[model samples]
Target: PWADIMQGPSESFVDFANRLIKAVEGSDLPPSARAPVIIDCFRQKSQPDIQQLIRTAPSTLTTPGEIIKYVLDRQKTA
Candidate 1:
């Protein structure tokens, strides 16, 4: 989803999403709620189609090891 973990300062969206996902996944939140929460931020954007994709994008956390595993699995799948 659209983690929107960072902007400006020439930071990386991937880097931010990685960190953000780890932080949130390690928190008390349940798995099902995490994706929705992350995606919700994109709702206000003008680009609805892109936002919707982000909204539905798989969690930065999934599979056995949470976001870390999700990234590895996605890479393999790609």
Candidate 2:
């Protein structure tokens, strides 16, 4: 059932990835900035939470690779 995905490694992997990705993506803007608010859902610890957040999260990012540029901006996004 849904529990399996929610409580399984696959889900955990996605959740964990989103968290790290959100951290990097949001890193584009200071935590004090709206970036956090924008990506906060991805920062959540559960797959469902991450998925929900992602649906609402900015779709501007087409690929996971896009996050690198944000991280590269160490001027303030770091």
Candidate 3:
């Protein structure tokens, strides 16, 4: 499962998302449906640092991609 695929130790947000996206890309599911599952898994499995950033990020971020982008941006400057 996608969640299981992402269960390992923490890594940089960009690297993690890139790996996840590649694994998901091989699946038959469409992005419309896939996004939610990816987000759910991310929400559940992301590291403490990633989770903290999400929590502190602006409220306008409702979707997984938005949060991911926020985290990615934060990491760039971190």
Candidate 4:
């Protein structure tokens, strides 16, 4: 049910976000806790090079959607 954690090679932003969000639904996290948890899944699961990109992203981008959007904008190979 948490299949969304793994973003597809050719997946779009919306699909990826939906995947992460769906993954969230399976868990019983409070509303505020989802973003940090989602961030961890994204950063840890992303390719090594992409990890640096995620690390380099602005701190202001806290949510999974924003971070993924920036990561894709920075480089979309992952």
Candidate 5:
């Protein structure tokens, strides 16, 4: 799935996240089920920054959508 989606050379994290979000939206997955799959997709993609965030981020910030938001916020300041 989205794991196969990688960041383009000039792409920012937010842009990469947006593309992933768009793919998730396009999928026929139910709203409630999308998060886990989305999260897994990112897990498979496993870029250095995302992997570090996943490892360091609090467990309370579960869900693909939440994680993506967290990454975006972190990226904005990084």
Candidate 6:
């Protein structure tokens, strides 16, 4: 199921990021619509923190590529 939470028990968010990109690539949505789809996935995967952050960042992060990189860049010890 591609719709399941992305983080495996042994995987870090890095692996989640890679999975996110591949999943987004597999999506059937239009180009301009991809980022929003990914944000939905973020929440589906229990990443509401990142999802909401991106929701507030559409003005600065308009593309899936930008959003993905932003998610990675935002990763840190917590």
- Candidate with top lDDT is 5
At residue 32, give the lDDT of candidate 4: 81
Model 4: CA > 4 A from native: 1-4, 8-14, 58-60
lDDT of 5 at 6: 78
Q: For candidate 3, lDDT tens digit of each residue in 1-78?
A: 454665346466667777776777678788678777777666666776666767776666767688787777786453
Evaluate model 6: give its TM-score: 0.51
Q: Extract clashing residue pairs from model 3.
A: none
Q: What's the ranking of the predictions by lDDT, best on top?
A: 5, 4, 3, 6, 1, 2
> Model 6: per-residue lDDT, tens digit, 1-78?
346646665566667867876777677767777667766676557355655666666467655567667767775546
For all candidates, the clash counts are: 0, 0, 0, 0, 0, 0
Task: Score residue 74 of candidate 6 by CA lDDT.
Answer: 70
By TM-score: ranked, best first:
3, 5, 4, 6, 1, 2
TM-score list, all predictions: 0.42, 0.26, 0.67, 0.63, 0.66, 0.51
List ranges where model 6 is wrong by over 4 Å: 8-11, 23-36, 43-46, 58-60
- The lDDT per prediction is 0.46, 0.40, 0.68, 0.70, 0.71, 0.64
Q: Which ten residues in a row have the lowest lDDT in candidate 3?
A: 1-10
The sequence of per-residue lDDT tens digits that candidate 5 reaches over residues 24-63 is 8787789887787777766656467666776677666667
For every candidate in turn, the CA RMSD to the true structure comes to 7.7, 13.9, 2.8, 3.2, 2.8, 3.7
Residues 1-78 of candidate 1: C-alpha lDDT, one tens digit per residue? 234444334433445456665765777788888766554432333144334444455654233234323333443221
The candidate with the higher lDDT, 2 or 5, is: 5
Candidate 5 vs. true structure, TM-score: 0.66
The weakest ten consecutive residues by lDDT in model 6 span: 1-10
